[PDB]
Structures are given as C-alpha cells and as structure tokens.
C-alpha cells in the first residue's frame, strides 16, 4: 500500500538520523501523511514497526552479499570485501546506533528480545561462512569459528559505527583493520 | 553553586535515562531554574557534555593507576581493552550514554565536541603503541590509524555483543586481543 511503504522509509530515516527514543510515531504519521490509525492497523505498535523494519533490512543486506560475495574467489577476500561492503551498504549497518537503543531498553521483555537474537545470528553467520569454509580449503586454521566471527562482527561493526567522513579513508581503514585480523589468525 | 545542577543530572540521566530527562526535572530538584541553566551550559546536550568530560578525567585517573601494574606495553593493551569492557559492563551513565550518541551523532555543534572526548579514549592507545615500538615489543608505522582501528574495533565488542555471560565476553576479549596483535607482528 502506497500508506504501508509509504510510512516504512519515513520511518526508516527518521530512525537513522535521530535514532530511537527522538523517533516519536506522531511525527511518522506526519511526514508520511497518514493516520494514528494506519500505522496502528499495519504495524500495531511503534516497537513492531521497528521489528519489521530490522526484519526487511537484514533481508535486503542477506541478498545484497549473496549476490556480491562470488565476485571474491578466496574466503580471505570475502573477507575484505564483506568489511568494504559494511561501509558502503545502505542497510542495516546504517541503524546499528537505533538497534543498540533499541536492544538495551527492550532487552528484559523476552517477546521481542528472542526475535532480534535471531536477527543477530544471520548477521553473523555470514563470518561463520567464511571462516568455516576458509578451513576446508586450508586457508588457516581456527578451532572456535564461533568465537571468531562473533568478534569479527562486532569489532567491525564497531569500525563501521564508530569511525560526514571521507569514504575513502575508511574504506583503508577497513582493509588495514582486515589485514591485521587475518594475519592474527595465522 | 554549578556542581549542584550537574550531580542531580547525571543521577536523573542514571535513573531515568537521557531523553526522559526533561532540563525542568534538573531545575525542580536542584533549587535552581530554567535561567541559571541557559546560562552555565546554553542547552541540555551541553550539560550532558559537561558531565561526559568530568567523567573521562575520573576514566583516566582510573587508568593511570591500574596501568602500572602492566609491565610491558602488550600488557597494557590487554589490559585496557579488557578494562573497558568489565568497567562499561555495570557503569551507569552507559544507558544515557548510549542514547545520546545514537541522538546526536549527527551535529555539527555537538560532534566536534563528540569526537575530541572520544579521541582521549583512543589517544591512550596512541601511547602504549608508540612506546611499544620504541620497547623493541613492535614495529607499527602508522600508529595513528592503528590506533583509531584498535579503539573503535575494541568499542565494537564491547557494545554489540549482545551475548550474556561476563565470563564469556572477557574470553572473546581476550581472544580479539590476541588476534590483534598476532597481525601487528
Ligand atoms: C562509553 C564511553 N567510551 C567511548 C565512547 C562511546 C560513545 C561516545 C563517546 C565515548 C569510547 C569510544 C571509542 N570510540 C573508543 C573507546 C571508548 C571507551 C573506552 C573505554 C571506556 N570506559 C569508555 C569508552
């Protein structure tokens, strides 16, 4: 409906820019001129509506590197390029700083707690990959892939979050940070 | 005097958070008004800038004493990265904290002031590198962007890992700490 995409993208910026909290529903409605109602009847709550966002933004960003991961012939370079990507994606990177506001205040209530592990698992699968499959053709050994693509996302995360900024800078920034990591696993 | 304004804000911040917060609330129970505040800090993302860097004294007070009990630089570093977590882990000011960055993070007023405060809290790491080459432990050329990779990477774990656990969060801290170094060689 041109009043269901039409209230998600409001919502999506909104949350970009001003992250959760300042994100007030009343101003969504506003700008995306729609009712209470609307939103009520697509979205029910404010937090659902952030849920479903996160929901399609971590599919966009799985199809994304689905389709850009077979452009790196080695594991070792989809590594490289999955952390370039992070810096250049238009999803889900870009909310991390709403995700963290979001997680930290609704993380007793289980109900949607359990939906955002589940939505912090995929985001790290894509590490569990590389490295998994960088020990199967030998590219270095690594006996808790797990604990390794954990710290891999979120010291990664952390560059892309915590470094406008030139996107050129970062960009060697980023492989720096790659370069030093990989020759710490060897 | 302006010591009052800002004690019962950062404990308001503490306990309800910093959008929940209202500059009224401050000015109710500190015995003071909406004027007097206008005037020692213009706004209210001003005074919760105020207490960021009183904070960041005490952080460095913190760590000038706890770092002499590493000898050696690489010491350090697993020291202070694994220092950060833990003391982050039951700080506080971490919630409010959180919310005003993911606010304003994106003002040019407020950013340039965001980013001189972080830039204390990676120039430390500045300092164990450096000293590190010269102690023979390395050899990093540019210690500048290594240190900003290190300090945000480092800040990375320490506020996604939406693990549980402590116990598991200063392994896979350690582990990074390991890692990263391991490639500086
Ligand atoms: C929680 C404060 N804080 C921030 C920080 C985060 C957001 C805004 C301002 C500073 C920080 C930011 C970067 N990049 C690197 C290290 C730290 C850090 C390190 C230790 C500590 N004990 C607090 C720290």
């Not at 952030?50 to 971590?58: A, D, Y």
């Not at 990177?93 to 709403?98: E, F, G, I, R, T």
């Not at 985001?123 to 569990?128: E, T």
């Amino acid at each position: 409906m041109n009043l269901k995409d039409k209230i998600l993208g409001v919502a999506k910026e909104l949350f970009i820019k001003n992250g959760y909290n300042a994100t007030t529903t009343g101003e969504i409605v506003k700008l995306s001129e729609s009712s209470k109602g609307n939103l009520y009847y697509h979205f029910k709550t404010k937090e659902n509506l952030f849920l479903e966002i996160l929901n399609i933004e971590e599919s966009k960003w799985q199809e994304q590197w689905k389709s850009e991961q077979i452009k790196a012939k080695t594991n070792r370079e989809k590594f490289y390029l999955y952390n370039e990507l992070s810096l250049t994606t238009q999803y889900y990177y870009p909310l991390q700083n709403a995700i963290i506001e979001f997680y930290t205040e609704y993380y007793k209530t289980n109900s949607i707690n359990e939906k955002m592990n589940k939505l912090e698992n995929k985001y790290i699968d894509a590490y569990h990959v590389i490295f998994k499959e960088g020990n199967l053709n030998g590219e270095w050994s690594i006996n808790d892939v797990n604990a390794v693509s954990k710290i891999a996302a979120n010291a990664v995360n952390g560059i892309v979050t915590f470094t406008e900024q030139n996107i050129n800078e970062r960009i060697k920034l980023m492989n720096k940070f790659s370069q030093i990591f990989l020759n710490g696993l060897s």
